[PDB]
Amino acid sequence: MEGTEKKFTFWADKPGAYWVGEGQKIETSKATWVNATMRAFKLGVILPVTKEFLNYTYSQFFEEMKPMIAEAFYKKFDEAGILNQGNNPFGKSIAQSIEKTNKVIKGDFTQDNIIDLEALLEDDELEANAFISKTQNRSLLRKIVDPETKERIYDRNSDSLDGLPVVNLKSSNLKRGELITGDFDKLIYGIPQLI
Amino acid sequence: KDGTLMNEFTTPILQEVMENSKIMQLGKYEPMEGTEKKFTFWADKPGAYWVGEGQKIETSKATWVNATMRAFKLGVILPVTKEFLNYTYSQFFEEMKPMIAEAFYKKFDEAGILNQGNNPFGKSIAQSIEKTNKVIKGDFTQDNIIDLEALLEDDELEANAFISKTQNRSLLRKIVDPETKERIYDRNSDSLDGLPVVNLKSSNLKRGELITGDFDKLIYGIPQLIEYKIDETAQLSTVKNEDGTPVNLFEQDMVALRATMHVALHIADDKAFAK
Amino acid sequence: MEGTEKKFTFWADKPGAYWVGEGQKIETSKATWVNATMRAFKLGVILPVTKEFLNYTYSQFFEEM
Amino acid sequence: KDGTLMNEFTTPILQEVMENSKIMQLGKYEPMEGTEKKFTFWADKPGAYWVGEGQKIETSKATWVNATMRAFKLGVILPVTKEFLNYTYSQFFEEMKPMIAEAFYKKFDEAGILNQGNNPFGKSIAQSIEKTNKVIKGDFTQDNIIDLEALLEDDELEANAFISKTQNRSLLRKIVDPETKERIYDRNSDSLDGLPVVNLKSSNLKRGELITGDFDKLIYGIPQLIEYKIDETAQLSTVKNEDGTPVNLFEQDMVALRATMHVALHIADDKAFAK
């Protein structure tokens, strides 16, 4: 998409009485905001420019580097939206929680607080599939002192905090605390247009 | 807006409404005008080699309560002008009828299980309050949860799945206890006693858990009438308010359905009490 | 399409002496809202409708009306 | 920026009138740069048995002019964002090129006949009329128009049709001739005396018609060029304000087509008197 597409209609429905018939209607729409941007490399690219023109192997390596930079482009956009708030988009993951309402705290760490965080999510009524966590944060989350342990997995494929499988991604974030992702729309146009 | 639309917007939450309709099942589903009579028990025992004696038991259920569907107020009147002028809004209204049909099953299941806003007498919470109490939502304890299972064994009642709201499930998931047994959680769904159960959206308190045994389901169909009658009792806010006389125009489609639930002998329900 | 839609475009004139290419194009849009509804029959046609059911000559007059 | 979509662009029945006026003038075109004049006027003796005076005058006049169409900046900046989103803007650019070509012929006529621009400078019809002083003061009468047309034919070459400036033609139509005949009335085509009059829009000219026959008109070719690299900034708004035009492809294509015109002095024109 060129911008942001409008969300699907909710429309609440209930049976109620046998004779009476009433149905609620709800409308949702999203406005177009924020666009992706890619900048050319400085200092390092200038050294590679002379090598690619003279040698054939360096020119082929530069084409292979374009594919590596394309993977880094998706990694940079995801890390900024989830942590430190360095993205163009307003109200996302950490920025959305800080503006509206706080759910969890990274300052205080407790085994009972982790179970209490799941109870707060049940009252808020939000469904989560996978929780995004950095490599540095995952090492601290793996080992913890507690009287009783429930839902961790670890040995199978990935370590679980509440009781669900999640993949770890490399991002600049603090070791203390864990973040969870709900629902977010993804948009892509392509990779490398100008040579 | 003043009755103007440039582009049609897609409706939010579709899977949640469909899940609530499938969740309301315990003792089969069959098409009937009222309530069908139950199957005969007839107790049989071997006893002696020469002597032969057999007990006979008869069961029957009387026809009571019928399903009712009402047309939408205020919101449907705004949509009536849009559907007549624009082709996209008219197609959206037909898609909304299918969404309201899923909400019809969700409204009937929530009223029977919680708050007692159903036409039927003696169901889930209403049946437990009238006959005998099994569980309490006022007091919460890990030992009491194990004690509730022991009380069900003495009562002799079989349960497949326990119906629980989204707000109640969040409180039930996290609990402080010295020893934990039968929870699952990571596989598909969290278990309270040791059995798989699907969660449905219903207006209920966070404290306490309810269990379903056996209940009969009845259905006639969805959306019969398309043309809407003149509004007088229903409140209108958009464009013009109606109280007495109204112009003949379709705003919300009328649905015809019939539902009757069979009364259960034993059912587990929790009620909150102040200390 | 519902309502009314109108589009207008204007082009800017370029300089005589060659130095720099001048752009800037003007765009205008016009739209009209609210459509008039046709009036329904009242007591005047209602008196004729009763005669149309009984008499054959009055039945043809209702179609002509 | 680029919020609501209009999906409409102005085309034809405006540029066609300006193109027809330039074609109605009729002038010889040459591919080679520069011009040349012919030798005129020679002295002759009347005296008997004597050589007398004997001198012949030679004339040579070169003509060369370069013309270029100006590219948009203010309107072109808004169009750049629309071009990437909508395919209609690319088709609109082809229609805009025809309008710019029509404006190119209009600017060449306004500089000579109306003296608005400095394209021709030396060889101008309005400048030649001011130097000769053949223009009539005040409002043009029906009897005065015939006298002015007869005066031009006696001194110089007779013109086929007088140039119209839209508003001047309407005032001439209201006036009636002394004889039993309609003056400046158009049944199918508008004509001053015999030949069809050409209508042209001018900012400087408002009242008074000028009659000209012999006029040179030469063109290099068609005005079409590819757009690359941003040049000449006036107004730009998208994300950040900029003083000098840089980065990306050009917003508007600048067309180059050289045009040259030579005047033989035949126009008289008319000007209104002020008190």
Author numbering:
A (entry chain A): 66 to 260
B (entry chain A), D (entry chain D): 35 to 309
C (entry chain B): 66 to 130
Sentences from the paper on this structure:
80α is a typical example of a staphylococcal transducing phage, capable of transferring non-specific chromosomal or plasmid DNA at low frequency. The capsids are assembled from a major capsid protein (CP) as empty precursor procapsids into which the DNA is packaged through the portal by the phage terminase. Many SaPIs, such as SaPI1, redirect the 80α capsid assembly pathway to form capsids that are smaller than the normal phage capsids and that are thus incapable of packaging full-length phage genomes. Here, we report the structures of a mature 80α capsid made from an uncleavable version of CP at 5.2 Å resolution and of a wildtype SaPI1 mature capsid at 8.4 Å resolution.
The structure of the DNA-filled SaPI1 mature capsid was determined to 8.4 Å resolution using AUTO3DEM from 6471 particles picked from these images. The SaPI1 mature capsid displayed the expected T = 4 icosahedral architecture comprised of A5 pentamers and (BCD)2 hexamers located on fivefold and twofold symmetry axes, respectively. CP subunits A–D derived from the 80α CPFA model were placed into the SaPI1 density by rigid body fitting, followed by real-space refinement in Coot. Density for the N-arm was apparent, demonstrating that the extended conformation seen in the CPFA capsid was not due to the lack of CP cleavage. The distribution of CP subunits within hexamers, however, is dramatically different in the 80α and SaPI1 capsids. In the SaPI1 capsid, CP subunits on opposite sides of the hexamer are >11 Å further apart than in 80α, leaving a larger hole in the middle of the hexamer, and the hexamer has a distinct bend of ≈10° relative to 80α. These differences presumably reflect the different environments of the hexamers in the T = 7 and T = 4 capsids. In the T = 7 80α capsids, the hexamers are located on the flat face of the icosahedron, whereas in the T = 4 SaPI1 capsids, they sit on the twofold axis at the edges between faces. In the T = 4 SaPI1 shell, there is no rippling of hexamers around the threefold axis, and the dihedral angles α and β are identical to those observed in the procapsid. In this case, the distinctly different environment of the hexamer on the twofold axis is accommodated by changes in the hexamer itself.
